[PDB]
């Protein structure tokens, strides 16, 4: 079968999150499902579970006291409650059916939760113009900082989506300030550069912003 | 609770046989279960109970337990089977526990030193009293590198971020890295650079508030 | 009548505590009751309020979100319950009976609810000798640190008791460290320096722990 | 929300008459109510609505509101009435608001010099990284003080924390403060410095890790 999980969810330190998982068929019949969890770079470390058909549910030493893995009436979904939220339970959470013998066959998408003290922010975008000189004789690399929004994501096109040979669009950083940070860059022929506009298309949903920079020659 | 060993990296050409070792205390006793995790998506059941395979999952992964050591075996290695490896085990004493997980890179493609770009800061975040620089490494592999900033030669501590290596369309990698500062400190000096280390080898860009 | 509230609390950030209000004659009637909270040194700051005999409750814009005032089923009860404590809930907490043009006649003694990142630590006790010169040429001044103890509070005494007059024992410090500190002092005749054996006696139940310090001259 | 402003201090000597004032917006328009708190004790509702004494308040308090302005008044100055006054109103727009409050000193007493003491560190905390002076400051009326150290003569910003003068058996007021640094600092300076300042005037103490 299959196990669906909920959406993203941003939250404030202190606060708390509750996660869904529904089985795919209407029930979990006599399965335990568990609660994974993944740090970003981070492994896989265990959380707890639960078995729907006996209303029991185990726990990790590590979470005991600030989780709390429930069901509903029709035992169709299995839900994880973790309290206090930190800058360390940034993470992302799975759910997973597990094994007679120990292991987990499925898994669900997971579910993304950052855990931050900012609050929602649209991006400064600058431009990364090419420099007086030229890049790589031929050659020429421009692009755009999309700096301090707040959540992700962003997405980045080049030209409306004309421009997309050359183009790379960078991760995210995560900086002291909790804001979030990153840069798209494209390769395009030094001699481009004076007769053909370069834009790229910023667009931050979560703050209903949109930025189409203009980027031209230093 | 218990504790599951793994190598953090694994190398192998193409064809080539690759083996992820797992170890822990009488491991042997214990059911092991390998999950396959590629960017982005969830882990995948590929050998469980020691050597059991599941539906879906090719011959090509063996498993095998025995002593303090268990050991997921991937013949004839396709770049396919490129993906971070975790062991695991069920300790009434630790529950579920996890190994530290290894990536596996399926070295298909030869060495590319990666090209360096850094752009001073754009005049117009000085408006915001800001002033950052940019330094875009791409087409390197493997993905791994490091990278160092210096302000006028020397080392520089404060203000750096960095992103760890990702494919780029071409199955290439690249990275970016970040020196934060203000326009004072940007103007105050005669220069900046950002240094690439790669494979042994080193790569570095410098820009001048005066340029 | 009067209105009993329950003891101090002590909690880590993130937690949640939850304080007692019981009147006096059994029940609040058909009394409005408030809580109003109090940070050191700081004013007094009304939270909310609730009427047991409606079942109804009010709250502050500030804590709209974080608090709930509840009562218990013989509303001979009503409770406070604050979340996601910050360093900055550390206050006393009071309850107090709403009149009908808008004061509070009736007051709790209070309760005190710090909110710390600190575990419970028993105190180190330094001495302040005396100087080799002597203080106020007649009488001298010698005493104890009690540095470093978490949470409040500690007494302090003098050779058992005994030592009474020329006694002060300072209130506590709250360094960054999160830690407690304080002081006691006693004026004694310089003569009585040398041949007067001088201890003060600290206590710190909330450790089981008691320091008889000795304080010699330097 | 809406604003109560009271004076923050209101000196008053025995006998005479105390007025504590309260202002805020048609404040004449509300119903006016003072409470008296002293140290370590909850609020005491002393006159509401405007004027009423509840039973067991003397009647020396009196209270009066018009304007954007709530009086509070204490005839015949007692010891007894030293304390903090809050006057609060209820405003459909804020609740319930209280004033910033006003400390009564009851000046029954002559002004008293501060005696300061300045113990250096005891070797015994070096054993702990630690090397604390404490500062005593005592026998002093009215109850305000500032202090400052100093370290061979210049001021000191960091490691300073000092307690609010409070009562000390004799009716006088005692303050503390303690200077936090590593025993390395404390022993590498000539000498270190406590400057109280009272009603004007500056006591200072020094001690030298020599001495």
């Known amino acids: 079968v299959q196990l669906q999980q909920s959406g993203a969810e941003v939250k404030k330190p202190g606060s708390s999150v509750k996660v869904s998982c529904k089985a795919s068929?209407?029930?979990?019949?006599?399965?335990?499902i568990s609660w994974v969890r993944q740090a970003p770079g981070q492994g896989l470390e265990w959380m707890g579970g639960?078995?729907?058909?006996?209303?029991?549910?185990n726990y990790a030493q590590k979470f005991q006291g600030r989780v709390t893995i429930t069901t509903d009436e029709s035992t169709s979904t299995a839900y994880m409650e973790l309290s206090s939220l930190r800058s360390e339970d940034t993470a992302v959470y799975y759910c997973?059916?597990?094994?007679?013998?120990?292991?987990?066959?499925?898994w669900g998408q997971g579910t993304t939760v950052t855990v931050s003290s900012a609050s929602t922010k649209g991006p400064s975008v600058f431009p990364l113009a090419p420099s007086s000189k030229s890049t790589s004789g031929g050659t020429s690399a421009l692009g755009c900082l999309v700096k301090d929004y707040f959540p992700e994501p962003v997405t980045v096109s080049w030209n409306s989506g004309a421009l997309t040979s050359g183009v790379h669009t960078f991760p995210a950083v995560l900086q002291s300030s909790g804001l979030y940070s990153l840069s798209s860059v494209v390769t395009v022929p030094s001699s481009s550069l004076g007769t053909q506009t370069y834009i790229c298309n910023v667009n931050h949903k979560p703050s209903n912003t949109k930025v189409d920079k203009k980027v031209e020659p230093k | 609770s218990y504790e599951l060993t793994q190598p953090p990296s694994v190398s192998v050409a193409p064809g080539k046989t690759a083996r992820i070792t797992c170890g822990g205390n009488?491991?042997?006793?214990?059911?092991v279960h390998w999950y396959q995790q590629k960017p982005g998506q969830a882990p995948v059941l590929v050998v469980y109970?020691?050597?059991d395979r599941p539906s879906g999952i090719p011959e090509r992964f063996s498993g095998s337990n025995s002593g303090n050591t268990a050991t997921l075996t991937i013949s004839r290695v396709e770049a396919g089977d490129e993906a971070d490896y975790y062991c695991?085990?069920?300790?009434?004493?630790?529950?579920?526990?996890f190994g530290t997980g290894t990536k596996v890179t399926v070295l298909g493609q030869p060495k590319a030193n990666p090209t360096v770009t850094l752009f001073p800061p754009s005049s117009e975040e000085f408006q915001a009293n800001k002033a950052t620089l940019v330094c875009l490494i791409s087409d390197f592999y493997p993905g791994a590198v490091t990278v160092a900033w210096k302000a006028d030669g020397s080392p520089v501590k404060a203000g750096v971020e960095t992103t760890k290596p990702s494919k780029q369309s071409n199955n290439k990698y690249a990275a970016s890295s970040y020196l934060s500062l203000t326009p004072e400190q940007w103007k105050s000096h005669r220069s900046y650079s950002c240094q690439v280390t790669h494979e042994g080898s080193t790569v570095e860009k410098t820009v001048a508030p005066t340029e | 009548v009067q209105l009993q509230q329950s003891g101090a609390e002590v909690k880590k950030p993130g937690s949640s505590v939850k304080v007692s209000c019981?009147?006096?004659?059994?029940?609040?009637?058909?009394?409005?009751?408030?809580?109003v909270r109090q940070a050191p040194g700081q004013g007094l700051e009304w939270?909310?309020?609730?009427?047991?005999?409606?079942?109804?409750?009010?709250?502050?814009q500030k804590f709209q979100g974080r608090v709930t005032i509840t009562t218990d089923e013989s509303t001979s009860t009503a409770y406070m319950e604050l979340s996601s404590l910050r360093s900055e809930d550390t206050a006393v907490?009071?309850?107090?009976?709403?009149?009908?043009?808008?004061?509070?006649?009736?007051?709790?003694?209070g309760t005190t609810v710090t909110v710390s990142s600190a575990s419970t630590k028993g105190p180190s006790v330094f001495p302040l000798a005396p100087s080799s010169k002597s203080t106020s040429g007649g009488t001298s001044a010698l005493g104890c640190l009690v540095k470093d103890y978490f949470p409040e509070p500690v007494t302090v005494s003098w050779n058992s008791g005994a030592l009474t007059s020329g006694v002060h024992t300072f209130p506590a410090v709250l360094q960054s460290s999160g830690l407690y500190s304080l002081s006691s002092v006693v004026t004694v005749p310089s003569s009585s320096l040398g041949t007067q054996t001088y201890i003060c006696n600290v206590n710190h139940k909330p450790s089981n722990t008691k320091v008889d310090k000795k304080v010699e001259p330097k | 929300s809406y604003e109560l402003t009271q004076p923050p201090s209101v000196s008053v000597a025995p006998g005479k008459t105390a007025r504590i004032t309260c202002?805020?917006?048609?404040?004449?328009?509300?119903?006016?109510?003072?409470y008296q708190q002293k140290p370590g004790q909850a609020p005491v509702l002393?006159?509401?609505?405007?004027?009423?004494?509840?039973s067991g308040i003397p009647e020396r308090f009196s209270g009066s509101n018009s304007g954007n302005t709530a009086t509070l008044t204490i005839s015949r100055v007692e010891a007894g009435d030293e304390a903090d006054?809050?006057?609060?109103?209820?405003?459909?727009?804020?609740?319930?608001?209280?004033?910033?409050g006003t400390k009564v000193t009851v000046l029954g007493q002559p002004k008293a010099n501060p005696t300061v003491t300045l113990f250096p560190p005891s070797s015994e905390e070096f054993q702990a990284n630690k090397a604390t002076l404490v500062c005593l400051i005592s026998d002093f009326y009215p109850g305000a003080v500032t202090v400052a150290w100093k370290a061979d003569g210049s001021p000191v910003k960091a490691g300073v924390e000092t307690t609010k003068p409070s009562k000390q058996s004799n009716n006088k007021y005692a303050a503390s403060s303690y200077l936090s640094l590593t025993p390395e600092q404390w022993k590498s300076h000539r000498s270190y410095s406590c400057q109280v300042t009272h009603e004007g005037s500056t006591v200072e103490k020094t001690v030298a890790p020599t001495e």
């Open positions: 997973a059916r597990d094994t007679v013998m120990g292991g987990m066959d499925v």
């Open positions: 068929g209407g029930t979990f019949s006599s399965y335990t």
């Open positions: 109970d020691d050597s």
């Open positions: 695991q085990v069920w300790d009434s004493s630790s529950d579920y526990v």
């Open positions: 009488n491991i042997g006793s214990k059911s």
């Open positions: 639960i078995t729907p058909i006996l209303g029991i549910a």
